[PDB]
Amino acid sequence: SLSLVDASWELVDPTPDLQALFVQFNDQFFWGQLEAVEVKWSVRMTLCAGICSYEGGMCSIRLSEPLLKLRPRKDLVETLLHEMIHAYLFVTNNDKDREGHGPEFCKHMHRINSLTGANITVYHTFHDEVDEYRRHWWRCNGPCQHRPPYYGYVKRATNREPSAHDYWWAEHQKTCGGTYIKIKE
Ligand SMILES: Nc1ncnc2c1ncn2[C@@H]1O[C@H](COP(=O)(O)OP(=O)(O)O)[C@@H](O)[C@H]1O
Ligand SMILES: [Zn+2]
Ligand SMILES: [Zn+2]
Numbered sequence: 554s555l556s557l558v559d560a561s562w563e564l565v566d567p568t569p570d571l572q573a574l575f576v577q578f579n580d581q582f583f584w585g586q587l588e589a590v591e592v593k594w595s596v597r598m599t600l601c602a603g604i605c606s607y608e609g610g611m612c613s614i615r616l617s618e619p620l621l622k623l624r625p626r627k628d629l630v631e632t633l634l635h636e637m638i639h640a641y642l643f644v645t646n647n648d649k650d651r652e653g654h655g656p657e658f659c660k661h662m663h664r665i666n667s668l669t670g671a672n673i674t675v676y677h678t679f680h681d682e683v684d685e686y687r688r689h690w691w692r693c694n695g696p697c698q699h700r701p702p703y704y705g706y707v708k709r710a711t712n713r714e715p716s717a718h719d720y721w722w723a724e725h726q727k728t729c730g731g732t733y734i735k736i737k738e
Contacts, residue, residue, distance in 0.1 A: 555581055557630060558670035566626045571616065574633060582634070582665050583641050587612075590640045592633070594618045597702035601677060603632040604704045605639045612640045615704060624679070627671070634665055634673050653736060689738035691715055695731015705731075712738055 571594055579587040590612045598604070602620045606613045614636045621629050638661045642648040650657050654675035662673045678686055687708040692698065698705035707715050715733040716722060725731075 555668045556670050557627075562627045562630075563625050565623060566629070569626070569629055571629075571633070574630065575614075575637075578634060578637060582661075582668065583637060586644055587637060587640055589644065590614060590637070592616070592636075595701060598704065600703055600706040600708050602628070602679070603636040603677070604706070605636050605643070606699045606704060607643045608699075612643050613699065614640060628679055631671055631673050634671065635662075635677070638662060638665075638673070687737075689713070690736035691733040692736055693725075693729060693731040693733050695729040697725065697729040697731060700729070707733060708737070 571592060575587075575592040579585060579590075589610075592614045593616070595615045596618045598615060598617045599619050602617050604615050606615075614633070616629065616632060616636075621632060638658055639648075641661060642657055647657055652658075654662075658675065662675065665671065666673055672680070674680070687710050689709045689712050691707040691709075691714065693705035693707075695705075697703070714735070715725075
């Protein structure tokens with residue numbers, strides 16, 4: 554069975570094996586196609602539970618140890634599978650939907666949920682979180698997408714774009730110099 558909803562889905566895993574999960578899911582759900590993709594824990598990241606970075610090539614996934622270590626297994630697994638769908642669309646040159654999570658995303662999302670009983674979702678909060686999260690997102694198109702601890706992200710409560718108004722702006726200009734493309738609000 555490919556079912557993931559077992560006894561232990563709603564419970565914290567003190568010793569997750571992220572590499573093993575990746576290998577398993579590449580084989581079971583992505584037809585082996587994610588060979589070039591790598592997956593790492595971050596002990597530093599907090600703006601996102603999960604991210605991808607694409608060299609535009611090699612694809613990287615990062616999972617937030619701060620946000621996931623104490624959460625139920627299901628949240629690690631659903632976050633990882635969400636990121637692997639983005640990775641798959643990148644690897645297969647099928648990431649041309651206008652939306653972040655357009656029809657292509659929902660096909661894999663819906664399909665993997667069918668196979669496993671999981672609930673991968675198009676939103677990037679946890680199912681139990683309330684509505685007190687920042688909705689306006691930018692991502693830098695410079696090298697800092699790969700750079701810890703923000704991976705290019707800026708998440709704000711209003712449409713307040715990254716600018717010289719920001720205390721960190723001059724630094725980012727020197728250390729990256731990329732431009733902040735609007736994504737969430
Ligand atoms: N040097 C940096 N380069 C790029 N982004 C940075 C840098 N320093 C901070 N940031 C951005 O600023 C955020 C921290 O801002 P914060 O101090 O929480 O104020 P705000 O209320 O504007 O979010 C980070 O999450 C990241 O998006
Ligand atoms: Zn996503
Ligand atoms: Zn940048």
